[PDB]
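Example 1169.
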Amino acid sequence: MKIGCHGLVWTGHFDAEGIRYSVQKTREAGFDLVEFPLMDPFSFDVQTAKSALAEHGLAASASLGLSDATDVSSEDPAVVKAGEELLNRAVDVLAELGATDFCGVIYSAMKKYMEPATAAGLANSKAAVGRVADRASDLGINVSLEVVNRYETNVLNTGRQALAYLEELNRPNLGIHLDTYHMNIEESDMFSPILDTAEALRYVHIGESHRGYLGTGSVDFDTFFKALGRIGYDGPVVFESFSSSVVAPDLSRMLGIWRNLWADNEELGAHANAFIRDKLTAIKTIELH
Amino acid sequence: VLFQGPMKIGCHGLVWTGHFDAEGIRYSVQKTREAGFDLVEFPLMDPFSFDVQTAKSALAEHGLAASASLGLSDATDVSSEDPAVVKAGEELLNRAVDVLAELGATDFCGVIYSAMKKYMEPATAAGLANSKAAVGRVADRASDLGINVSLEVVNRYETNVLNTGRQALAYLEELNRPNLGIHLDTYHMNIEESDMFSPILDTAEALRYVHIGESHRGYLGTGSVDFDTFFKALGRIGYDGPVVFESFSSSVVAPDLSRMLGIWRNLWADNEELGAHANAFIRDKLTAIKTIELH
Amino acid sequence: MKIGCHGLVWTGHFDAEGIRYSVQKTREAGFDLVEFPLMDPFSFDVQTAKSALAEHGLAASASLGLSDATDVSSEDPAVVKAGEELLNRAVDVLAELGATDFCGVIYSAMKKYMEPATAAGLANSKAAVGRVADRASDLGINVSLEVVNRYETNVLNTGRQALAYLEELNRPNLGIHLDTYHMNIEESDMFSPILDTAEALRYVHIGESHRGYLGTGSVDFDTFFKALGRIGYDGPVVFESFSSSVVAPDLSRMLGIWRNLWADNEELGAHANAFIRDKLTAIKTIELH
Amino acid sequence: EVLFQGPMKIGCHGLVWTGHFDAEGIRYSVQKTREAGFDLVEFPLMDPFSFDVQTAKSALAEHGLAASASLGLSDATDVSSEDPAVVKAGEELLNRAVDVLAELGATDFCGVIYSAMKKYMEPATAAGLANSKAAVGRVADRASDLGINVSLEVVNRYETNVLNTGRQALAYLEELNRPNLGIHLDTYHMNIEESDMFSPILDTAEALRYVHIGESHRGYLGTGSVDFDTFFKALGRIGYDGPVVFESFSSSVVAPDLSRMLGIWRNLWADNEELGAHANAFIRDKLTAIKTIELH
Ligand SMILES: O=C(CO)[C@H](O)[C@H](O)[C@H](O)CO
Ligand SMILES: O=C(CO)[C@H](O)[C@H](O)[C@H](O)CO
Ligand SMILES: O=C(CO)[C@H](O)[C@H](O)[C@H](O)CO
Ligand SMILES: O=C(CO)[C@H](O)[C@H](O)[C@H](O)CO
Ligand SMILES: [Mg+2]
Ligand SMILES: [Mg+2]
Ligand SMILES: [Mg+2]
Ligand SMILES: [Mg+2]
Ligand code: NA
Ligand code: NA
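Predicted structure in complex with D-psicose:
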């Protein structure tokens, strides 16, 4: 169980300086893992990353969100093939890094669709995801589909939909990824989805309802962490937060970050690392006696 | 018999129908009273072709009050930098205010300060100035007709202007119009706000309209919204404006609104049970909170 | 799944009039069932009750809390036998009434112990409770041990303790009774006790944190009812509230009811009926579509 | 090392550490309280006559730690008794406790000081209440001249029959009208009696001068039913900057009288070093987090 921080706490540009900065600041805030947003994995400086991770003795993972030009839920096979080629490059980036986990909105575009998912689009997604999963299987990489809210996909809005999606592909390294931010909008409660997906849950995002400081919003973290403890979850737990103060050219506009929710990210990250770790410590004590 | 007091318990029309032709108006007015509500809220996405006579007739027959909400779009975006786009929306808003006056309604609300969509760029100072100026004109027009206007705070995916009650407060202070007020929504508050009582307390004076929605917009009490704290806080400020249920499912589709609001999922089929559940939920909540000042 | 009301919403005296009064009002507020507090089962008017239940078509159950003089968790076997004979008469009363459910603090005194439990006292309790369960069994009655808080017993304060207690007795009609008012104090959360006790959960009390109006205190009813949804619970669900305005000379003092929490019980009972039936109506829709 | 300067002291109650406050327990508890990160230790002055003040003074200076004391009366000392002998025994127990604090150079005295801390079997009587009010009014006056604040702790129905809610406590103060007399709320007891976790804070605003952070069952924080989020948010909205003191009880750490009085029947923790550090970190992190809310 590694405790991680999403790279957009620190920078929005993952050039050499941004890779080095984020890795270092992640280590300084107390985390074990940095999660690299590979929005563009074709231009991600793997050498700078492997060097920075080794220096700070830190682990890496990667998340990603596709767009209109790379939508695998598209009925246009050229667009589905673009996304599958991007997803495959990211898996390659993770293999080069020696990392084990790939996750995110890799089953559709990460946007506000204006129509429902189509049956054919869903097949294209499932086929695509299955091929990525198989390719990732030979390289030692787990793939987790992130359930996100109605405004960021029209495909996987609940843990149950994710479970049905997986059940068709029945790939041994393909898992579900839950984000407390997204749960707090779409799910019926913060404990049933964790119980429901028990075996399939392989990646977790910790995010406040407005995506700022932990425990300054509407997200029921207590119920969540107690559920996680009950199914014996031992995957990554990764802080995630977005503010006007750290902008990415792509991601910040896709996630609708219009507001300043922090300025001092070194305080935000240290606090969050403390928040998650002490949540896990308290829950262990329900477990025993 | 019409309920004459100010705190009316209302239903959003989209529990009942997506189409507000004459049958849709009649179906929703009837089903709304059959559920126990005092008021129906009409989604005037198009107020130019809204059958005002049918609405008058059905409201009188069933003895029901009405209000109207609305969300703009790209062609009607008042936060657009182009005075032609701005003035298209401004004509849209004006017709809605007129439709309400004909109905004898009091309350106009919704996302009327920008398009109701997923923006890709933060707001501009120029568009912000356009929204304020136009909203200031619509409020003026409404004031002569005995209509209040309430700006609905909604989540980051539905506007890039007013995402918190604090932003709305600041927006009103600039315009300083006596009939312009704030409209909060528990669904939206559950995303953007810090907690469910601070928005109520900060907004106290300006809170004129409230929407009751579960976190996923389904059945009340099957999601993650903290209704207890919200209602307790409403009772602490002695709120007595409208309180209106709001729910969307793929069962009942609007060609426009269902797609703008991202209703991909089926959350209920039986809307008679939904509306009846929600009426009791709101009214029993209000009944319980009243007992707290005594114990 | 009958939805019940505790008798002290209506009266503190279960003489002929009290019995008739409590049965009438329970039905007028909309309940299916009235739970009689059998503080003194020897003097309970069974005939008036059977009369009143049939007149208003209402089901019945009974609850009870032992006192110092009847403490089956005593080391004094004369006290233990007084307690056993009182429990036995209560079981008898339920048989005559034609009821199925007996519940309450029947494994110890209901009081503020000034000493931890003794091993000798714990063994007295289990053996007495076992005999009452055996007796009850031949009359088709379930016996449900109510988990209460640290101030009302020193024996069974959590569902986990109740399960371990049951494990040693292995009686087929012995179950656990949970009260939200008590869980809100002693339990780690409102779902995990339900899931842990699912087999043996046979009776439920619905009470606010201060025992007044439902939804005017600190109890997490949402998580509670959703957990009951998860395990398929369909035993009795009974409203329980206490106020200065309805006094039971014994029970009001034992429970520490010092405050006015309601003056008009007719509104209170109607509200609590709607509240519970509406929680259940909504939870049913979570399960499927 | 160095004494925390300001008023908002993050403290720890002594029964996290030990149940006996002879010289050894005082030293043990002060050292561990500083070790876990706290600014303050609250001594349970159940018996203030036999309290070793000079040892206390030593340990507090050595470890750079502030102090306060809490206390709960009993049958023999019930200042809400109608027997004036019993009220006097209480008033003289309270007075010595006042005195120990002044010797320590403390500022805060709190606890269940308006009655016995027990499960009463009868409602409060008008005569007892009269005794309680006048007697507390005197202990407050006496404490006033010494620079001591006196905070009445609101506790649940099973531990008193006088002050079970914030509103009751207000009406008690309004009748005494004493400047140094204040209210002490406890999230554990609030979780039972109050209407919610923010109204008692908003209602008590002025007179709120002491705060106990205890979980619903009184073990680790964040492993129970207490709504800490709303509570700390409400603290932030009123600008509260008094003490904030952790409080936990487990059968691993037993005081002869107190642990029985409070019904500590269960084992809720054993490694109290980790508990205190966890609790300290919990409170400071909560207060950090909530200070961000005004800005956003
Ligand atoms: O929470 C998320 C978006 O709503 C996901 O983690 C994103 O896919 C991630 O930020 C991409 O790097
Ligand atoms: O909640 C809303 C949309 O998110 C607003 O109330 C809309 O304006 C409404 O649904 C349209 O009538
Ligand atoms: O909750 C209870 C006592 O605290 C139980 O319901 C009692 O056994 C009941 O009130 C007595 O009939
Ligand atoms: O919370 C308390 C009891 O529940 C009070 O603080 C006690 O009186 C305290 O432990 C006595 O020192
Ligand atoms: Mg995420
Ligand atoms: Mg709304
Ligand atoms: Mg009970
Ligand atoms: Mg305390
Ligand atoms: Na929430
Ligand atoms: Na609670």
